[PDB]
Design an enzyme around this catalytic site. Structure first.
Site, PDB file in Angstrom:
ATOM      1  N   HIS B  54       0.801  -1.202   0.000  1.00  0.00           N
ATOM      2  CA  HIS B  54       0.000   0.000   0.000  1.00  0.00           C
ATOM      3  C   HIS B  54       0.857   1.286   0.000  1.00  0.00           C
ATOM      4  CE1 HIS B  54      -3.142  -2.894   0.412  1.00  0.00           C
ATOM      5  NE2 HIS B  54      -4.065  -1.957   0.506  1.00  0.00           N
ATOM      6  N   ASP B  68      -5.287  -7.869  -1.035  1.00  0.00           N
ATOM      7  CA  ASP B  68      -6.505  -7.441  -0.355  1.00  0.00           C
ATOM      8  C   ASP B  68      -7.656  -8.485  -0.468  1.00  0.00           C
ATOM      9  OD1 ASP B  68      -5.345  -5.078   0.493  1.00  0.00           O
ATOM     10  OD2 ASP B  68      -6.592  -3.831  -0.827  1.00  0.00           O
ATOM     11  N   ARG B  93       0.673 -27.679   2.157  1.00  0.00           N
ATOM     12  CA  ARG B  93       1.337 -26.665   2.966  1.00  0.00           C
ATOM     13  C   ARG B  93       0.573 -25.357   2.840  1.00  0.00           C
ATOM     14  NH1 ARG B  93       6.492 -23.404   1.504  1.00  0.00           N
ATOM     15  NH2 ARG B  93       6.641 -22.219   3.456  1.00  0.00           N
ATOM     16  N   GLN B 185      11.584 -19.403   3.987  1.00  0.00           N
ATOM     17  CA  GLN B 185      12.774 -18.991   3.248  1.00  0.00           C
ATOM     18  C   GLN B 185      13.600 -18.005   4.059  1.00  0.00           C
ATOM     19  OE1 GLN B 185      11.064 -19.694  -1.264  1.00  0.00           O
ATOM     20  NE2 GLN B 185      11.843 -17.656  -0.783  1.00  0.00           N
ATOM     21  N   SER B 188      15.291 -14.810   2.498  1.00  0.00           N
ATOM     22  CA  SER B 188      14.575 -13.798   1.756  1.00  0.00           C
ATOM     23  C   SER B 188      14.290 -12.517   2.476  1.00  0.00           C
ATOM     24  CB  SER B 188      13.225 -14.377   1.301  1.00  0.00           C
ATOM     25  OG  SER B 188      13.425 -15.519   0.478  1.00  0.00           O
ATOM     26  N   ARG B 257      19.153 -22.999  -3.770  1.00  0.00           N
ATOM     27  CA  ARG B 257      19.581 -22.921  -5.146  1.00  0.00           C
ATOM     28  C   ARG B 257      20.810 -23.817  -5.214  1.00  0.00           C
ATOM     29  NH1 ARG B 257      19.858 -16.348  -5.777  1.00  0.00           N
ATOM     30  NH2 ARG B 257      17.668 -15.998  -5.169  1.00  0.00           N
ATOM     31  N   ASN B 326      12.785 -25.361  -0.180  1.00  0.00           N
ATOM     32  CA  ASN B 326      12.185 -24.829  -1.380  1.00  0.00           C
ATOM     33  C   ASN B 326      13.245 -24.832  -2.487  1.00  0.00           C
ATOM     34  OD1 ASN B 326      10.028 -24.271   0.302  1.00  0.00           O
ATOM     35  ND2 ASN B 326      10.097 -22.045  -0.005  1.00  0.00           N
ATOM     36  N   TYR B 328      13.815 -23.717  -6.716  1.00  0.00           N
ATOM     37  CA  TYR B 328      13.311 -23.233  -7.994  1.00  0.00           C
ATOM     38  C   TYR B 328      14.388 -23.304  -9.073  1.00  0.00           C
ATOM     39  CZ  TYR B 328       9.143 -21.671  -5.613  1.00  0.00           C
ATOM     40  OH  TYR B 328       7.939 -21.539  -4.959  1.00  0.00           O
ATOM     41  N   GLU B 407       8.384 -26.293  -1.626  1.00  0.00           N
ATOM     42  CA  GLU B 407       7.954 -25.525  -2.775  1.00  0.00           C
ATOM     43  C   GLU B 407       8.817 -25.900  -3.927  1.00  0.00           C
ATOM     44  OE1 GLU B 407       7.880 -21.163  -2.427  1.00  0.00           O
ATOM     45  OE2 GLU B 407       7.135 -21.352  -0.337  1.00  0.00           O
TER      46      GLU B 407
END
Ligand SMILES: *[C@@H]1O[C@H](CO)[C@@H](O[C@@H]2O[C@H](CO)[C@@H](O[C@@H]3O[C@H](CO[C@H]4O[C@H](CO)[C@@H](O)[C@H](O)[C@@H]4O)[C@@H](O)[C@H](O[C@H]4O[C@H](CO)[C@@H](O)[C@H](O)[C@@H]4O)[C@@H]3O[C@@H]3OC[C@@H](O)[C@H](O)[C@H]3O)[C@H](O)[C@H]2NC(C)=O)[C@H](O[C@@H]2O[C@@H](C)[C@@H](O)[C@@H](O)[C@@H]2O)[C@H]1NC(C)=O
Ligand SMILES: *[C@@H]1O[C@H](CO)[C@@H](O[C@@H]2O[C@H](CO)[C@@H](O[C@@H]3O[C@H](CO[C@H]4O[C@H](CO)[C@@H](O)[C@H](O)[C@@H]4O)[C@@H](O)[C@H](O[C@H]4O[C@H](CO)[C@@H](O)[C@H](O)[C@@H]4O)[C@@H]3O[C@@H]3OC[C@@H](O)[C@H](O)[C@H]3O)[C@H](O)[C@H]2NC(C)=O)[C@H](O[C@@H]2O[C@@H](C)[C@@H](O)[C@@H](O)[C@@H]2O)[C@H]1NC(C)=O
Ligand SMILES: *[C@@H]1O[C@H](CO)[C@@H](O[C@@H]2O[C@H](CO)[C@@H](O[C@@H]3O[C@H](CO)[C@@H](O)[C@H](O)[C@@H]3O[C@@H]3OC[C@@H](O)[C@H](O)[C@H]3O)[C@H](O)[C@H]2NC(C)=O)[C@H](O[C@@H]2O[C@@H](C)[C@@H](O)[C@@H](O)[C@@H]2O)[C@H]1NC(C)=O
Ligand SMILES: *[C@@H]1O[C@H](CO)[C@@H](O[C@@H]2O[C@H](CO)[C@@H](O[C@@H]3O[C@H](CO)[C@@H](O)[C@H](O)[C@@H]3O[C@@H]3OC[C@@H](O)[C@H](O)[C@H]3O)[C@H](O)[C@H]2NC(C)=O)[C@H](O[C@@H]2O[C@@H](C)[C@@H](O)[C@@H](O)[C@@H]2O)[C@H]1NC(C)=O
Ligand SMILES: *[C@@H]1O[C@H](CO)[C@@H](O[C@@H]2O[C@H](CO)[C@@H](O)[C@H](O)[C@H]2NC(C)=O)[C@H](O)[C@H]1NC(C)=O
Ligand SMILES: *[C@@H]1O[C@H](CO)[C@@H](O[C@@H]2O[C@H](CO)[C@@H](O)[C@H](O)[C@H]2NC(C)=O)[C@H](O)[C@H]1NC(C)=O
Ligand SMILES: *[C@@H]1O[C@H](CO)[C@@H](O[C@@H]2O[C@H](CO)[C@@H](O)[C@H](O)[C@H]2NC(C)=O)[C@H](O)[C@H]1NC(C)=O
Ligand SMILES: *[C@@H]1O[C@H](CO)[C@@H](O[C@@H]2O[C@H](CO)[C@@H](O)[C@H](O)[C@H]2NC(C)=O)[C@H](O)[C@H]1NC(C)=O
Ligand SMILES: *[C@@H]1O[C@H](CO)[C@@H](O)[C@H](O)[C@H]1NC(C)=O
Ligand SMILES: *[C@@H]1O[C@H](CO)[C@@H](O)[C@H](O)[C@H]1NC(C)=O
Ligand SMILES: *[C@@H]1O[C@H](CO)[C@@H](O)[C@H](O)[C@H]1NC(C)=O
Ligand SMILES: *[C@@H]1O[C@H](CO)[C@@H](O)[C@H](O)[C@H]1NC(C)=O
Ligand SMILES: *[C@@H]1O[C@H](CO)[C@@H](O)[C@H](O)[C@H]1NC(C)=O
Ligand SMILES: *[C@@H]1O[C@H](CO)[C@@H](O)[C@H](O)[C@H]1NC(C)=O
Ligand SMILES: *[C@@H]1O[C@H](CO)[C@@H](O)[C@H](O)[C@H]1NC(C)=O
Ligand SMILES: *[C@@H]1O[C@H](CO)[C@@H](O)[C@H](O)[C@H]1NC(C)=O
Ligand SMILES: *[C@@H]1O[C@H](CO)[C@@H](O)[C@H](O)[C@H]1NC(C)=O
Ligand SMILES: *[C@@H]1O[C@H](CO)[C@@H](O)[C@H](O)[C@H]1NC(C)=O
Ligand SMILES: *[C@@H]1O[C@H](CO)[C@@H](O)[C@H](O)[C@H]1NC(C)=O
Ligand SMILES: *[C@@H]1O[C@H](CO)[C@@H](O)[C@H](O)[C@H]1NC(C)=O
Ligand SMILES: [Zn+2]
EC number: 3.2.1.147
Lengths: 499, 499
Positions: B54, B68, B93, B185, B188, B257, B326, B328, B407
């Site tokens: 916001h 929202d 999860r 994570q 992050s 990673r 996780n 990716y 993930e």
């Protein structure tokens, strides 16, 4: 001799008969806004209106609308200035978002310099165009952190956090801002925020509204109202002791209504009408003029009504240089029971009155103000003479104050298309009919009113209604919010101001 | 002998060749979500992802989208269950929004019973359909009040507030929930929230991003990471000392990673690759396995790296029953300068590495993962073998942990129309190619992996990207969010699970 109309049709939209020259030369004319309703969340922290509208979307409006982006006056503040310049307005009321300048609530946690810069640029732009700012410190948008730390105005910790916020505002902006409002509509947060839970933060007794996260509608309105008065008064003392060099003025904002008896020959309805004046206006004006709550409130509310210490009484009494009076409408009052032992008891029941827009003989008080499509018996109607009655009453009852009318306006439906929305003759009629009575009361009763700010500069997020109604004198397209285009009302008001 | 493909085209979408029966009988298959991304703000307080999106709408996503309303899993949680049931999934999860159960942040300020009821009903519904919950306590959505009171994870006050929140979760839900994740994570928030200010709360050094409200990108990531580890470890100690009767397991979530040398015959690139393992994985896994940060971090980061006391070291070391990993993608690493005296220095520079998806001879590591339309040289590419390499490394370096893949998934563009979006063959290819390598590493290396949760159950708000990308295995229409319709990937995954 001034004659003013109370019923349709109105003929005060003719600037040949009513215009700014009808008022004293120095009289200020403009429009008003508030920060949650216009700015957007960009560049600020989160406040309880963000919290409330997001946690309780069906309470934000029927469209679940909120202030996330709205008319984007963060980006388009210059366009707001342009509307004011087009109007040849001499005043503009806006609010400072606490969450924009102190996102973490408590000043010692740091300030947002870019937020400060935003208001500096707005203020400088207004003054460059000859517009006098009227700046509201607190238009309901309390930093969420403060509500979560201590439940905001429920706790006396609010006083010092509000004071430190206000001190920053006076320090940063008071060299240019000479008219300050402390708290918008003192009655509203206690009753709607902590009584009925229609407004942020959304607290109430469990049987009043099971969605409330916490609360007590019988007690909390009084606590919150008391803290508002103390926080207001501490800020006014700070202003008048530490910022007297700035040569400005400060006051609270009241929501005013007039009240008439539902049955003007029935003593019980007459009594309810006088109780309503005390419970609605006197709740705050008693403290502000005398340092005490009205005796009827002392008697009725009993142990639920906080006491002022002698030091507090002295701080609150006289804590204004002027009053910002908002006025929209008037109600008829009839007696109603006050069931203090009911689990659904609310503070609002303590007045012992039921409020309507139709009297006992079936007379509707005036033209339509707001249609309620779910229940038409709940439609609101307006009453132009009420502004006369309110101002006269304030002069007579409350020691001849200096007054600015800090809001007055009417909505049109968000279901109307743009051409219908721009053809807002109902708004001209409302504004002119009230201005006629305002001139009349100044001339006849010598009330010290020195300006008038119509609600609103432009279409915006309306508390409780989302974007389902429009209040602006200028139109905003929600698909592309950049422009603010004067409606017929804005064009009329331009002519009224410079006839 | 298992052979797995690294490059297009993939042929592992044939459930005749790869399916759940390829894995141990007990292996859990499901999908994942998080609360900010799916629920909506209805019924909860405000958190720093509300605040950040916001205040800084251009950081929320290119569309300025936010959580929202999103997919309205507050209203449609049963529809999420229905997707899982359609999949015949055995795991799901999800996260608990702290702001839904303790809107005021600190537990002593009260709980939201209706929020607790929301998660009770979800949990009960999952268990009724044979789905094992994996519940994340903290998926970034810190109550805004805590950020405003003390800047959240920047301050050690977070530890006890997080502990009391977690205790409430174990008390209310741990009779049914047997797999808990503490912090999503770990890497992050320190780096993106307090380094680059891409993520909430949005703090950084002034010359890194002038819009940040406060911060120091060189120091704050380390402070926040340290507090995360301590808060995590305090919660794991609470769980294992006070909730052992529940018979469950708890662990952190890591973003993993792999890293390969940009030039595999260049000692400097090889060194940068090993530094990246330490700085990316070891930052957290060193403390979690040994109670200390990696020596290269101690040496490089110097006085900016906090110390653990002997008591803290003992609390953090071994503070997991399992790891949620996780995964990716993988990056190539080459050397880069670390300008610690520059005003724009960030913690991320301390690794002394530059990361790419193309190596020195021009080889792209694998198929496209994420297209970047403003700068195509910044496109991300994936590397299926990386899941093998990561799991092998965790087994060998980090003491043969129990692992759940919490993930793994890929986006498709939000510009695609619904038919294109449902024809998500690129997602089948990504998921199957990783599952092939996951089976391979379990069989070849004996890594103790016991489940796999694909990201995401359904389309949702993507941090930083709004609704401009889709990750779901089921499709959601943003004009009418009720349904979650399995895409080709979801249909494939259904067949993989029950072949
Ligand atoms: C403007 O502010 C003025 C104050 O600066 C208001 O005048 C005060 O009005 C008070 C009533 O609201 C009145 O107080 C009462 O005093 C009684 C007399 O006490 C003195 O002599 C005693 C009397 O026998 C003795 O016990 C006391 O110690 C004193 O010596 C007294 O019993 C009252 O208490 C009962 O009633 C209150 C409810 O009103 C109950 O709360 C209380 O438990 C008790 O049951 C009351 O005493 C006040 O009690 C509460 C305590 O916190 C207060 O400190 C205590 O004062 C007071 O005497 C006057 N003060 C003066 C200087 O006149 C004025 O009120 C209006 O005008 C007065 C004359 C009266 O008509 C009010 O009803 C009007 O509201 C305020 N004006 C306006 C417009 O509001
Ligand atoms: C797993 O955890 C193990 C600890 O439980 C790690 O082993 C520790 O590794 C520490 C280095 O990181 C090492 O500490 C050094 O000790 C030197 C020896 O001091 C003793 O004898 C002194 C020596 O002359 C004397 O002053 C001390 O009072 C002791 O008597 C010492 O100088 C080192 O300090 C310099 O270096 C540190 C940076 O490393 C600077 O921060 C410090 O200012 C100084 O400049 C260091 O001392 C540590 O100093 C910081 C202070 O907060 C610590 O309390 C102090 O211990 C330590 O001796 C061993 N402990 C043991 C029990 O072996 C282990 O590290 C790995 O393995 C060790 C052998 C080494 O190869 C490390 O580089 C590896 O990381 C951890 N394992 C992993 C995989 O991380
Ligand atoms: C505005 O308020 C006035 C004052 O209250 C209303 O007038 C009062 O109306 C009462 C009826 O609601 C009248 O009382 C009744 O009188 C008839 C004739 O004697 C009788 O049969 C009734 O039982 C009733 O009497 C009362 O019963 C309850 C007892 O406790 C009480 O002692 C009895 O008074 C009452 O006389 C009348 N007062 C005056 C001074 O006129 C007025 O009501 C409107 O006008 C009256 C005259 C009558 O026509 C009502 O129908 C009509 O509603 C009210 N105005 C409106 C528009 O509601
Ligand atoms: C993968 O990394 C390897 C190892 O760094 C790269 O090979 C090295 O590439 C250097 C050029 O970037 C070679 O050095 C040059 O040698 C020529 C011939 O003598 C010379 O005229 C140069 O000035 C330069 O010499 C260096 O100058 C800087 C001095 O500080 C330093 O002492 C001198 O070494 C270097 O010999 C070579 N090393 C090896 C073991 O082959 C490799 O670069 C790629 O292969 C080399 C053989 C060459 O064809 C490069 O054009 C080609 O980029 C790099 N691979 C890639 C794909 O980047
Ligand atoms: C609102 O708070 C009031 C005051 O704490 C509660 O009222 C009291 O109720 C207790 C329990 O009945 C009573 O013993 C007192 O006599 C009452 N005090 C007064 C001043 O009225 C009221 O139960 C609370 N309401 C709600 C819905 O929680
Ligand atoms: C309801 O309101 C109407 C309008 O104000 C009141 O009617 C006026 O009554 C006065 C005094 O009897 C008459 O002189 C007027 O001519 C009436 N006006 C019209 C428009 O009818 C009426 O008295 C009110 N009813 C009550 C019960 O209070
Ligand atoms: C980040 O905080 C670090 C530590 O407070 C600041 O770094 C120091 O800068 C002071 C002033 O130069 C120096 O005297 C110290 O030697 C530095 N300490 C270390 C540990 O590096 C750094 O100015 C701050 N950065 C920003 C942008 O405010
Ligand atoms: C860049 O990546 C490519 C692909 O992994 C590497 O090329 C492989 O190099 C190995 C060892 O020389 C050869 O056996 C393979 O046949 C090559 N694969 C193909 C697809 O070319 C290459 O060495 C990497 N470059 C650097 C500089 O590290
Ligand atoms: C202004 O209104 C007054 C009546 O109050 C009128 O006499 C005057 O002529 C009007 N001015 C103009 C310019 O129409
Ligand atoms: C609106 O929302 C609340 C949850 O905040 C729910 O309790 C109430 O039933 C809903 N109202 C209507 C009219 O559906
Ligand atoms: C005024 O400013 C001075 C300097 O901060 C401070 O000492 C004093 O307490 C303030 N005053 C108020 C509200 O009167
Ligand atoms: C509770 O109040 C509602 C509205 O205030 C009212 O209609 C209802 O009769 C009340 N019930 C009780 C038990 O008094
Ligand atoms: C939006 O409105 C502004 C002002 O009229 C206009 O200049 C701009 O082109 C409009 N944007 C679009 C996308 O139509
Ligand atoms: C602005 O109002 C002043 C004061 O009445 C007037 O002199 C001036 O002509 C007006 N300007 C316009 C453009 O209406
Ligand atoms: C499952 O995949 C295995 C190979 O891992 C294969 O042998 C088996 O037949 C497949 N099952 C079905 C039902 O296709
Ligand atoms: C986005 O927003 C920030 C204000 O939060 C502003 O500083 C920045 O310039 C804007 N970015 C772009 C690319 O316009
Ligand atoms: C455990 O629960 C007891 C009861 O509250 C408390 O005394 C003790 O400190 C808690 N333990 C932790 C984290 O070990
Ligand atoms: C500051 O950093 C940006 C990105 O980190 C870099 O491109 C630029 O050169 C840096 N400037 C200085 C003064 O080092
Ligand atoms: C929205 O989607 C649901 C599920 O398909 C459907 O039943 C409902 O009618 C749709 N609403 C509208 C307004 O189309
Ligand atoms: C669900 O998975 C179980 C376990 O493999 C299998 O026995 C059952 O047939 C599957 N059900 C469906 C409808 O696929
Ligand atoms: Zn919002």
């Amino acid at each position: 001799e001034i004659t003013c109309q109370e019923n349709l049709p109105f003929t005060c939209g003719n600037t040949d008969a009513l215009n700014s020259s009808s008022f004293s030369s120095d009289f200020i004319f403009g429009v008003a806004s508030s920060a949650y309703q216009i700015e957007g969340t960009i560049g600020r922290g989160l406040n309880i209106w963000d919290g409330f509208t997001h946690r309780y979307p069906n309470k934000s409006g029927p469209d679940h609308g909120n202030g996330d982006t709205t008319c984007d006056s963060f980006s388009y503040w210059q366009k707001d200035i342009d509307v004011l310049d087009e109007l040849n307005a001499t005043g503009y009321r806006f609010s400072i978002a606490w969450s924009r300048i102190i996102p973490r609530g408590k000043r010692s946690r740091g300030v947002n310099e870019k937020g400060i810069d935003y208001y500096h640029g707005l203020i400088s732009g207004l003054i460059k165009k000859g517009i006098t700012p009227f700046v509201t410190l607190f238009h309901w948008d309390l930093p969420q952190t403060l509500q979560d730390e201590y439940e905001g105005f429920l706790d006396p910790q609010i006083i010092d956090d509000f004071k430190d916020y206000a001190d920053l505002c006076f320090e940063e902006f008071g060299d240019s801002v000479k008219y300050w409002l402390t708290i918008n509509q003192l009655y509203s947060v206690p009753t709607r925020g902590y009584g009925s839970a229609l407004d942020a933060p959304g607290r109430c007794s469990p049987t009043v509204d099971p969605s409330c996260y916490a609360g007590n509608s019988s007690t909390e309105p009084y606590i919150v109202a008391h803290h508002q008065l103390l926080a207001h008064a501490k800020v006014v003392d700070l202003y008048r002791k530490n910022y007297t060099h700035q040569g400005g003025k400060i006051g609270p904002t009241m929501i005013t209504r007039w009240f008439l008896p539902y049955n003007d020959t029935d003593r019980h309805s007459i009594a309810a009408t006088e109780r309503m004046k005390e419970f609605f206006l006197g709740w705050f004006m008693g403290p502000l003029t005398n340092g005490t709550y009205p005796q009827i409130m002392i008697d009725t509310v009993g142990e639920r009504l906080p006491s002022f210490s002698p030091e507090e009484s002295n701080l609150v009494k006289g804590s204004y240089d002027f009053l910002g009076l908002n006025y929209y409408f008037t109600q008829y009052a009839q007696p109603s029971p006050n069931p203090v032992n009911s689990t659904n008891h609310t503070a609002m029941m303590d007045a012992g009155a039921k409020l309507t827009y139709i009297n006992a003989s079936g007379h509707y008080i005036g033209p339509l103000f707001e249609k309620d499509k779910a229940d038409s018996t709940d439609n609101i109607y307006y009453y132009p003479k009420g502004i006369y009655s309110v101002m006269d009453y304030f002069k007579n009852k409350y020691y001849n104050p200096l007054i600015y009318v800090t809001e007055n306006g009417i909505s049109t439906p968000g279901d109307e298309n743009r051409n219908q929305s721009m053809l807002d003759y109902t708004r001209i009629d409302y504004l002119c009919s009230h201005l006629c009575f305002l001139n009349k009361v100044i001339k006849e009763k010598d009330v010290n009113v020195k300006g008038y700010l119509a609600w609103a500069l432009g279409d915006n997020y309306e508390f409780n209604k989302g974007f389902t109604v429009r209040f602006g004198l200028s139109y905003i397209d929600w698909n592309n919010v950049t422009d603010r285009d004067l409606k017929k009302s804005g064009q009329w008001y331009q002519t009224f101001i410079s006839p």
